[PDB]
Tab-separated table of N, CA, C and O in Angstrom:
chain	number	residue	atom	x	y	z
A	1	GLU	N	85.876	18.029	-17.437
A	1	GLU	CA	87.000	17.074	-17.191
A	1	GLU	C	87.882	16.884	-18.430
A	1	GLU	O	87.426	17.020	-19.569
A	2	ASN	N	89.145	16.558	-18.174
A	2	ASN	CA	90.189	16.500	-19.186
A	2	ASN	C	90.441	15.091	-19.754
A	2	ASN	O	91.500	14.836	-20.334
A	3	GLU	N	89.469	14.192	-19.609
A	3	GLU	CA	89.652	12.795	-20.025
A	3	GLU	C	88.680	12.303	-21.090
A	3	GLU	O	87.489	12.609	-21.051
A	4	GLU	N	89.207	11.527	-22.034
A	4	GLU	CA	88.382	10.819	-23.009
A	4	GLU	C	88.123	9.398	-22.528
A	4	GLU	O	88.934	8.819	-21.813
A	5	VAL	N	86.984	8.849	-22.931
A	5	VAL	CA	86.578	7.501	-22.570
A	5	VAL	C	87.012	6.554	-23.686
A	5	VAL	O	86.539	6.674	-24.821
A	6	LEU	N	87.917	5.628	-23.367
A	6	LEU	CA	88.406	4.661	-24.354
A	6	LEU	C	87.612	3.353	-24.320
A	6	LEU	O	87.644	2.571	-25.269
A	7	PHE	N	86.915	3.124	-23.211
A	7	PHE	CA	86.106	1.930	-22.996
A	7	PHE	C	85.146	2.210	-21.845
A	7	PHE	O	85.514	2.877	-20.878
A	8	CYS	N	83.925	1.695	-21.946
A	8	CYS	CA	82.932	1.855	-20.892
A	8	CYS	C	81.961	0.699	-20.931
A	8	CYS	O	81.263	0.502	-21.936
A	9	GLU	N	81.900	-0.047	-19.828
A	9	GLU	CA	81.056	-1.237	-19.722
A	9	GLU	C	80.805	-1.633	-18.265
A	9	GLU	O	81.623	-1.353	-17.381
A	10	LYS	N	79.667	-2.281	-18.034
A	10	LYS	CA	79.326	-2.885	-16.751
A	10	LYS	C	80.349	-3.972	-16.437
A	10	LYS	O	80.670	-4.795	-17.295
A	11	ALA	N	80.874	-3.957	-15.216
A	11	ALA	CA	81.888	-4.921	-14.800
A	11	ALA	C	81.704	-5.270	-13.333
A	11	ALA	O	81.048	-4.547	-12.582
A	12	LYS	N	82.292	-6.390	-12.939
A	12	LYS	CA	82.302	-6.808	-11.561
A	12	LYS	C	83.756	-6.907	-11.194
A	12	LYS	O	84.562	-7.377	-11.997
A	13	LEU	N	84.101	-6.471	-9.989
A	13	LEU	CA	85.472	-6.559	-9.530
A	13	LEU	C	85.591	-7.742	-8.605
A	13	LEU	O	84.809	-7.883	-7.676
A	14	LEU	N	86.575	-8.592	-8.855
A	14	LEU	CA	86.826	-9.713	-7.972
A	14	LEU	C	88.247	-9.628	-7.458
A	14	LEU	O	89.157	-9.262	-8.202
A	15	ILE	N	88.422	-9.951	-6.177
A	15	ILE	CA	89.719	-9.869	-5.499
A	15	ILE	C	89.896	-11.120	-4.638
A	15	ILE	O	88.940	-11.582	-4.014
A	16	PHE	N	91.105	-11.677	-4.630
A	16	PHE	CA	91.379	-12.922	-3.908
A	16	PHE	C	91.208	-12.736	-2.392
A	16	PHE	O	91.673	-11.754	-1.808
A	17	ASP	N	90.504	-13.673	-1.771
A	17	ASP	CA	90.199	-13.595	-0.350
A	17	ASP	C	91.022	-14.664	0.349
A	17	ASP	O	90.729	-15.851	0.222
A	18	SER	N	92.057	-14.232	1.068
A	18	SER	CA	93.011	-15.146	1.709
A	18	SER	C	92.355	-16.068	2.737
A	18	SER	O	92.882	-17.143	3.030
A	19	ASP	N	91.205	-15.641	3.266
A	19	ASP	CA	90.385	-16.458	4.168
A	19	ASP	C	89.606	-17.531	3.398
A	19	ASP	O	89.677	-18.719	3.725
A	20	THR	N	88.865	-17.090	2.381
A	20	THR	CA	88.090	-17.958	1.491
A	20	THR	C	88.992	-18.843	0.629
A	20	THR	O	88.580	-19.926	0.209
A	21	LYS	N	90.222	-18.378	0.389
A	21	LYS	CA	91.184	-19.028	-0.515
A	21	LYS	C	90.716	-18.991	-1.974
A	21	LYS	O	91.091	-19.852	-2.776
A	22	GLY	N	89.909	-17.986	-2.314
A	22	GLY	CA	89.409	-17.810	-3.680
A	22	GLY	C	88.944	-16.392	-3.947
A	22	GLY	O	88.880	-15.570	-3.023
A	23	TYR	N	88.616	-16.107	-5.210
A	23	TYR	CA	88.187	-14.770	-5.618
A	23	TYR	C	86.760	-14.475	-5.191
A	23	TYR	O	85.858	-15.300	-5.384
A	24	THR	N	86.560	-13.298	-4.607
A	24	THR	CA	85.233	-12.869	-4.171
A	24	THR	C	84.879	-11.528	-4.776
A	24	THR	O	85.728	-10.636	-4.865
A	25	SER	N	83.614	-11.378	-5.156
A	25	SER	CA	83.129	-10.141	-5.754
A	25	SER	C	83.248	-9.012	-4.755
A	25	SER	O	82.838	-9.155	-3.609
A	26	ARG	N	83.825	-7.896	-5.190
A	26	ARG	CA	83.904	-6.699	-4.360
A	26	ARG	C	82.915	-5.639	-4.827
A	26	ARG	O	82.796	-4.584	-4.211
A	27	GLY	N	82.210	-5.914	-5.917
A	27	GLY	CA	81.160	-5.013	-6.369
A	27	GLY	C	80.964	-4.995	-7.864
A	27	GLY	O	81.797	-5.476	-8.618
A	28	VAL	N	79.843	-4.427	-8.282
A	28	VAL	CA	79.468	-4.329	-9.688
A	28	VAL	C	79.316	-2.850	-9.991
A	28	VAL	O	78.790	-2.105	-9.170
A	29	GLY	N	79.772	-2.421	-11.160
A	29	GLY	CA	79.670	-1.013	-11.527
A	29	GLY	C	80.141	-0.737	-12.934
A	29	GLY	O	80.501	-1.651	-13.660
A	30	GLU	N	80.141	0.538	-13.314
A	30	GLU	CA	80.563	0.955	-14.647
A	30	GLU	C	82.078	1.119	-14.658
A	30	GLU	O	82.618	1.914	-13.892
A	31	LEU	N	82.761	0.363	-15.511
A	31	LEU	CA	84.208	0.484	-15.675
A	31	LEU	C	84.537	1.368	-16.866
A	31	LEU	O	84.058	1.126	-17.976
A	32	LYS	N	85.363	2.382	-16.635
A	32	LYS	CA	85.798	3.255	-17.709
A	32	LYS	C	87.311	3.233	-17.820
A	32	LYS	O	88.016	3.341	-16.810
A	33	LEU	N	87.806	3.080	-19.046
A	33	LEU	CA	89.207	3.323	-19.337
A	33	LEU	C	89.301	4.760	-19.807
A	33	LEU	O	88.665	5.136	-20.793
A	34	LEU	N	90.086	5.556	-19.084
A	34	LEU	CA	90.169	6.999	-19.305
A	34	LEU	C	91.588	7.474	-19.586
A	34	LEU	O	92.536	7.074	-18.908
A	35	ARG	N	91.713	8.351	-20.577
A	35	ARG	CA	92.992	8.916	-20.975
A	35	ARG	C	92.904	10.440	-21.049
A	35	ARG	O	91.942	10.990	-21.592
A	36	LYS	N	93.906	11.112	-20.487
A	36	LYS	CA	93.989	12.570	-20.545
A	36	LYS	C	94.111	13.026	-21.999
A	36	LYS	O	95.042	12.621	-22.702
A	37	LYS	N	93.159	13.850	-22.443
A	37	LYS	CA	93.147	14.368	-23.820
A	37	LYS	C	94.449	15.089	-24.173
A	37	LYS	O	94.889	15.056	-25.326
A	38	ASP	N	95.057	15.725	-23.168
A	38	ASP	CA	96.297	16.493	-23.340
A	38	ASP	C	97.577	15.655	-23.209
A	38	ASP	O	98.640	16.062	-23.680
A	39	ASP	N	97.465	14.488	-22.577
A	39	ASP	CA	98.621	13.645	-22.287
A	39	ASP	C	98.263	12.178	-22.506
A	39	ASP	O	97.562	11.572	-21.692
A	40	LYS	N	98.756	11.609	-23.603
A	40	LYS	CA	98.468	10.213	-23.952
A	40	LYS	C	99.235	9.196	-23.081
A	40	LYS	O	98.995	7.988	-23.160
A	41	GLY	N	100.143	9.697	-22.248
A	41	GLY	CA	100.892	8.860	-21.314
A	41	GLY	C	100.157	8.663	-20.000
A	41	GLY	O	100.586	7.880	-19.155
A	42	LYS	N	99.047	9.377	-19.827
A	42	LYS	CA	98.245	9.278	-18.610
A	42	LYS	C	96.961	8.495	-18.842
A	42	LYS	O	95.982	9.021	-19.382
A	43	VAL	N	96.986	7.230	-18.428
A	43	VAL	CA	95.880	6.303	-18.650
A	43	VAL	C	95.535	5.585	-17.350
A	43	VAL	O	96.420	5.111	-16.647
A	44	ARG	N	94.242	5.504	-17.041
A	44	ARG	CA	93.775	4.838	-15.821
A	44	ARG	C	92.444	4.128	-16.027
A	44	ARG	O	91.737	4.387	-17.008
A	45	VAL	N	92.111	3.213	-15.114
A	45	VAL	CA	90.748	2.692	-15.051
A	45	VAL	C	90.048	3.330	-13.861
A	45	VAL	O	90.664	3.554	-12.827
A	46	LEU	N	88.766	3.641	-14.027
A	46	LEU	CA	87.946	4.122	-12.922
A	46	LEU	C	86.642	3.352	-12.922
A	46	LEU	O	85.934	3.332	-13.935
A	47	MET	N	86.338	2.701	-11.801
A	47	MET	CA	85.097	1.928	-11.684
A	47	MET	C	84.256	2.357	-10.469
A	47	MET	O	84.694	2.264	-9.323
A	48	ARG	N	83.052	2.840	-10.755
A	48	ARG	CA	82.122	3.325	-9.739
A	48	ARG	C	80.997	2.333	-9.550
A	48	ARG	O	80.319	1.988	-10.507
A	49	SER	N	80.778	1.900	-8.311
A	49	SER	CA	79.715	0.932	-8.004
A	49	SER	C	78.315	1.419	-8.356
A	49	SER	O	78.041	2.616	-8.346
A	50	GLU	N	77.442	0.469	-8.679
A	50	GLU	CA	76.009	0.729	-8.787
A	50	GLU	C	75.425	0.798	-7.375
A	50	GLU	O	75.911	0.139	-6.456
A	51	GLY	N	74.380	1.590	-7.202
A	51	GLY	CA	73.711	1.665	-5.906
A	51	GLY	C	74.408	2.626	-4.968
A	51	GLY	O	74.034	3.800	-4.887
A	52	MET	N	75.421	2.135	-4.258
A	52	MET	CA	76.198	3.003	-3.372
A	52	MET	C	76.918	4.133	-4.137
A	52	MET	O	76.964	5.263	-3.667
A	53	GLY	N	77.461	3.830	-5.312
A	53	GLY	CA	78.072	4.860	-6.151
A	53	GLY	C	79.495	5.231	-5.770
A	53	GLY	O	80.002	6.283	-6.166
A	54	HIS	N	80.151	4.366	-5.012
A	54	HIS	CA	81.512	4.634	-4.592
A	54	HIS	C	82.555	4.097	-5.553
A	54	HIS	O	82.275	3.219	-6.379
A	55	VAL	N	83.759	4.647	-5.442
A	55	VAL	CA	84.867	4.240	-6.279
A	55	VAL	C	85.337	2.865	-5.837
A	55	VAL	O	85.858	2.709	-4.729
A	56	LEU	N	85.140	1.885	-6.712
A	56	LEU	CA	85.617	0.515	-6.498
A	56	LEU	C	87.070	0.355	-6.938
A	56	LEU	O	87.834	-0.398	-6.332
A	57	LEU	N	87.443	1.072	-7.988
A	57	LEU	CA	88.787	0.985	-8.524
A	57	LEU	C	89.198	2.299	-9.157
A	57	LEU	O	88.419	2.902	-9.906
A	58	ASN	N	90.411	2.744	-8.840
A	58	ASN	CA	91.005	3.929	-9.447
A	58	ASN	C	92.508	3.718	-9.467
A	58	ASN	O	93.197	3.957	-8.472
A	59	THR	N	93.011	3.245	-10.605
A	59	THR	CA	94.416	2.852	-10.719
A	59	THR	C	94.932	3.123	-12.133
A	59	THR	O	94.178	3.017	-13.101
A	60	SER	N	96.212	3.472	-12.236
A	60	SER	CA	96.851	3.708	-13.525
A	60	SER	C	97.066	2.408	-14.302
A	60	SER	O	97.299	1.355	-13.706
A	61	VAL	N	96.956	2.491	-15.628
A	61	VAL	CA	97.384	1.419	-16.509
A	61	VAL	C	98.910	1.451	-16.515
A	61	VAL	O	99.517	2.499	-16.761
A	62	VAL	N	99.532	0.308	-16.233
A	62	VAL	CA	100.984	0.241	-16.168
A	62	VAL	C	101.548	-0.345	-17.462
A	62	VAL	O	101.130	-1.410	-17.914
A	63	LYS	N	102.496	0.358	-18.068
A	63	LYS	CA	103.076	-0.067	-19.352
A	63	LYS	C	103.729	-1.454	-19.287
A	63	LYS	O	103.699	-2.206	-20.255
A	64	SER	N	104.309	-1.779	-18.136
A	64	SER	CA	105.030	-3.034	-17.928
A	64	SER	C	104.139	-4.243	-17.664
A	64	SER	O	104.646	-5.368	-17.560
A	65	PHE	N	102.827	-4.022	-17.549
A	65	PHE	CA	101.882	-5.076	-17.181
A	65	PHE	C	101.085	-5.620	-18.366
A	65	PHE	O	100.736	-4.890	-19.282
A	66	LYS	N	100.772	-6.909	-18.320
A	66	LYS	CA	99.848	-7.495	-19.281
A	66	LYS	C	98.460	-7.532	-18.668
A	66	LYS	O	98.281	-8.017	-17.556
A	67	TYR	N	97.480	-7.043	-19.420
A	67	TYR	CA	96.073	-7.110	-19.046
A	67	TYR	C	95.434	-8.033	-20.056
A	67	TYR	O	95.150	-7.643	-21.195
A	68	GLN	N	95.246	-9.274	-19.636
A	68	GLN	CA	94.918	-10.360	-20.529
A	68	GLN	C	93.847	-11.221	-19.837
A	68	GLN	O	93.735	-11.186	-18.618
A	69	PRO	N	93.067	-12.004	-20.609
A	69	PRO	CA	92.051	-12.861	-20.003
A	69	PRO	C	92.664	-13.943	-19.119
A	69	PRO	O	93.845	-14.259	-19.271
A	70	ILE	N	91.863	-14.514	-18.216
A	70	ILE	CA	92.295	-15.661	-17.398
A	70	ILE	C	92.892	-16.782	-18.250
A	70	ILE	O	93.985	-17.265	-17.961
A	71	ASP	N	92.164	-17.182	-19.293
A	71	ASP	CA	92.594	-18.195	-20.260
A	71	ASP	C	91.638	-18.149	-21.444
A	71	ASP	O	90.786	-17.268	-21.514
A	72	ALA	N	91.746	-19.110	-22.352
A	72	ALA	CA	90.937	-19.094	-23.563
A	72	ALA	C	89.461	-19.387	-23.300
A	72	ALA	O	88.595	-19.001	-24.090
A	73	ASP	N	89.174	-20.059	-22.188
A	73	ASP	CA	87.795	-20.387	-21.818
A	73	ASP	C	87.124	-19.269	-21.039
A	73	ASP	O	85.927	-19.325	-20.759
A	74	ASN	N	87.896	-18.250	-20.690
A	74	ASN	CA	87.394	-17.172	-19.839
A	74	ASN	C	87.784	-15.804	-20.363
A	74	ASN	O	88.424	-15.015	-19.666
A	75	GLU	N	87.382	-15.532	-21.598
A	75	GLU	CA	87.734	-14.279	-22.256
A	75	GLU	C	87.040	-13.069	-21.655
A	75	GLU	O	87.462	-11.933	-21.870
A	76	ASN	N	85.976	-13.314	-20.901
A	76	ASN	CA	85.270	-12.240	-20.243
A	76	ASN	C	85.797	-11.942	-18.836
A	76	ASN	O	85.189	-11.179	-18.108
A	77	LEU	N	86.919	-12.544	-18.454
A	77	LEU	CA	87.468	-12.353	-17.102
A	77	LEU	C	88.919	-11.955	-17.267
A	77	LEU	O	89.764	-12.766	-17.707
A	78	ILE	N	89.191	-10.689	-16.964
A	78	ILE	CA	90.447	-10.080	-17.330
A	78	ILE	C	91.342	-9.973	-16.114
A	78	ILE	O	90.945	-9.392	-15.088
A	79	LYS	N	92.540	-10.535	-16.209
A	79	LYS	CA	93.506	-10.404	-15.108
A	79	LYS	C	93.990	-8.963	-15.087
A	79	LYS	O	94.359	-8.408	-16.127
A	80	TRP	N	93.940	-8.351	-13.912
A	80	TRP	CA	94.330	-6.966	-13.749
A	80	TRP	C	95.469	-6.849	-12.731
A	80	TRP	O	95.212	-6.628	-11.552
A	81	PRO	N	96.728	-7.007	-13.175
A	81	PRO	CA	97.831	-6.945	-12.210
A	81	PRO	C	97.911	-5.583	-11.552
A	81	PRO	O	97.624	-4.565	-12.189
A	82	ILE	N	98.308	-5.560	-10.284
A	82	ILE	CA	98.348	-4.318	-9.532
A	82	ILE	C	99.294	-4.464	-8.361
A	82	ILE	O	99.376	-5.531	-7.728
A	83	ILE	N	100.042	-3.404	-8.097
A	83	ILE	CA	100.833	-3.367	-6.897
A	83	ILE	C	99.999	-2.706	-5.794
A	83	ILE	O	99.691	-1.500	-5.846
A	84	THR	N	99.569	-3.560	-4.862
A	84	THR	CA	98.908	-3.157	-3.623
A	84	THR	C	99.910	-3.446	-2.529
A	84	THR	O	100.429	-4.565	-2.380
A	85	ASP	N	100.155	-2.408	-1.752
A	85	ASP	CA	101.515	-2.066	-1.411
A	85	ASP	C	102.421	-3.140	-0.832
A	85	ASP	O	102.074	-3.852	0.120
A	86	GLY	N	103.576	-3.254	-1.481
A	86	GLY	CA	104.528	-4.312	-1.225
A	86	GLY	C	104.530	-5.357	-2.325
A	86	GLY	O	105.598	-5.824	-2.738
A	87	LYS	N	103.340	-5.706	-2.820
A	87	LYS	CA	103.159	-6.969	-3.543
A	87	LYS	C	102.335	-6.872	-4.834
A	87	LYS	O	101.406	-6.075	-4.930
A	88	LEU	N	102.700	-7.692	-5.818
A	88	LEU	CA	101.937	-7.833	-7.051
A	88	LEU	C	100.735	-8.741	-6.826
A	88	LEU	O	100.884	-9.926	-6.497
A	89	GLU	N	99.551	-8.162	-6.994
A	89	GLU	CA	98.306	-8.893	-6.915
A	89	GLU	C	97.689	-8.904	-8.298
A	89	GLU	O	97.979	-8.022	-9.108
A	90	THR	N	96.849	-9.900	-8.563
A	90	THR	CA	96.043	-9.917	-9.763
A	90	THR	C	94.575	-9.781	-9.357
A	90	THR	O	94.021	-10.679	-8.727
A	91	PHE	N	93.960	-8.647	-9.684
A	91	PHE	CA	92.517	-8.511	-9.543
A	91	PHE	C	91.915	-9.133	-10.791
A	91	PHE	O	92.606	-9.330	-11.783
A	92	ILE	N	90.626	-9.428	-10.752
A	92	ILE	CA	89.941	-9.870	-11.939
A	92	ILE	C	88.768	-8.961	-12.216
A	92	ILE	O	87.981	-8.649	-11.327
A	93	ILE	N	88.684	-8.512	-13.454
A	93	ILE	CA	87.563	-7.727	-13.912
A	93	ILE	C	86.693	-8.625	-14.789
A	93	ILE	O	87.145	-9.177	-15.788
A	94	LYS	N	85.446	-8.791	-14.378
A	94	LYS	CA	84.536	-9.647	-15.100
A	94	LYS	C	83.536	-8.791	-15.848
A	94	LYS	O	82.883	-7.948	-15.243
A	95	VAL	N	83.439	-9.004	-17.157
A	95	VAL	CA	82.389	-8.400	-17.991
A	95	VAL	C	81.463	-9.515	-18.460
A	95	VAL	O	81.836	-10.694	-18.426
A	96	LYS	N	80.261	-9.147	-18.889
A	96	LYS	CA	79.241	-10.120	-19.209
A	96	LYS	C	79.606	-10.977	-20.416
A	96	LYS	O	79.354	-12.182	-20.429
A	97	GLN	N	80.212	-10.369	-21.422
A	97	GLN	CA	80.388	-11.077	-22.675
A	97	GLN	C	81.839	-11.249	-23.016
A	97	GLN	O	82.682	-10.391	-22.701
A	98	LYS	N	82.124	-12.359	-23.686
A	98	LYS	CA	83.459	-12.626	-24.193
A	98	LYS	C	83.949	-11.476	-25.077
A	98	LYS	O	85.101	-11.033	-24.947
A	99	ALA	N	83.059	-10.982	-25.941
A	99	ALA	CA	83.378	-9.897	-26.865
A	99	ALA	C	83.723	-8.606	-26.136
A	99	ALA	O	84.609	-7.881	-26.559
A	100	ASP	N	83.039	-8.331	-25.034
A	100	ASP	CA	83.383	-7.189	-24.181
A	100	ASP	C	84.767	-7.343	-23.581
A	100	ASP	O	85.488	-6.360	-23.431
A	101	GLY	N	85.131	-8.572	-23.224
A	101	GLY	CA	86.442	-8.848	-22.637
A	101	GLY	C	87.554	-8.617	-23.635
A	101	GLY	O	88.590	-8.036	-23.292
A	102	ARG	N	87.338	-9.066	-24.873
A	102	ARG	CA	88.288	-8.816	-25.955
A	102	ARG	C	88.425	-7.308	-26.266
A	102	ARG	O	89.531	-6.811	-26.504
A	103	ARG	N	87.302	-6.597	-26.258
A	103	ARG	CA	87.265	-5.141	-26.420
A	103	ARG	C	88.142	-4.465	-25.354
A	103	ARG	O	89.006	-3.638	-25.659
A	104	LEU	N	87.914	-4.830	-24.086
A	104	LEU	CA	88.710	-4.282	-22.973
A	104	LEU	C	90.204	-4.512	-23.172
A	104	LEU	O	90.999	-3.582	-23.093
A	105	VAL	N	90.570	-5.761	-23.441
A	105	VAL	CA	91.959	-6.147	-23.687
A	105	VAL	C	92.564	-5.378	-24.866
A	105	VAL	O	93.689	-4.871	-24.775
A	106	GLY	N	91.812	-5.289	-25.966
A	106	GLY	CA	92.251	-4.544	-27.151
A	106	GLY	C	92.503	-3.082	-26.840
A	106	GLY	O	93.545	-2.535	-27.180
A	107	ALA	N	91.542	-2.454	-26.176
A	107	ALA	CA	91.637	-1.039	-25.806
A	107	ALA	C	92.774	-0.733	-24.814
A	107	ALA	O	93.411	0.317	-24.902
A	108	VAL	N	93.022	-1.630	-23.863
A	108	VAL	CA	94.158	-1.438	-22.951
A	108	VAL	C	95.477	-1.553	-23.730
A	108	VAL	O	96.352	-0.688	-23.604
A	109	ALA	N	95.585	-2.571	-24.582
A	109	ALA	CA	96.796	-2.784	-25.376
A	109	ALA	C	97.078	-1.620	-26.319
A	109	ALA	O	98.230	-1.190	-26.442
A	110	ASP	N	96.024	-1.126	-26.978
A	110	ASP	CA	96.115	0.041	-27.860
A	110	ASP	C	96.539	1.274	-27.076
A	110	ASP	O	97.395	2.041	-27.536
A	111	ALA	N	95.935	1.463	-25.901
A	111	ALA	CA	96.314	2.559	-25.013
A	111	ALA	C	97.786	2.448	-24.620
A	111	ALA	O	98.515	3.441	-24.702
A	112	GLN	N	98.229	1.249	-24.227
A	112	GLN	CA	99.636	1.037	-23.848
A	112	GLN	C	100.658	1.374	-24.952
A	112	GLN	O	101.732	1.923	-24.675
A	113	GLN	N	100.322	1.025	-26.190
A	113	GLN	CA	101.173	1.295	-27.343
A	113	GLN	C	101.327	2.807	-27.559
A	113	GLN	O	102.426	3.297	-27.840
A	114	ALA	N	100.223	3.536	-27.405
A	114	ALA	CA	100.231	4.995	-27.501
A	114	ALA	C	100.973	5.668	-26.334
A	114	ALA	O	101.503	6.766	-26.491
A	115	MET	N	101.019	5.003	-25.177
A	115	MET	CA	101.763	5.506	-24.011
A	115	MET	C	103.268	5.586	-24.278
A	115	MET	O	103.951	6.448	-23.725
A	116	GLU	N	103.763	4.692	-25.132
A	116	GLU	CA	105.173	4.668	-25.545
A	116	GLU	C	105.527	5.877	-26.406
A	116	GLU	O	106.005	6.897	-25.905
């Protein structure tokens, strides 16, 4: 494969449930930030579930988007803006530790700067 791993950690994906009126876990798995070794403008996240082993998330990092924590009390919960068709949604990526969340945010921001 033609991709380097910029970040790799256990994560949970949460997505807003219009019925529940709140965020619900869509699965737990290994989250990787991946960049094409040949093209620094090609950056994506790929998250594969534990157990079932299916793709929970496969989406490009968007230069125009901020990938930032929920707030200062929730550094381990990263807002992940995404266009799911028609509309801007915010998914949440939850990692176990605050430090992991800062790592994720740092690595996405660093990746975005190199995309320019």
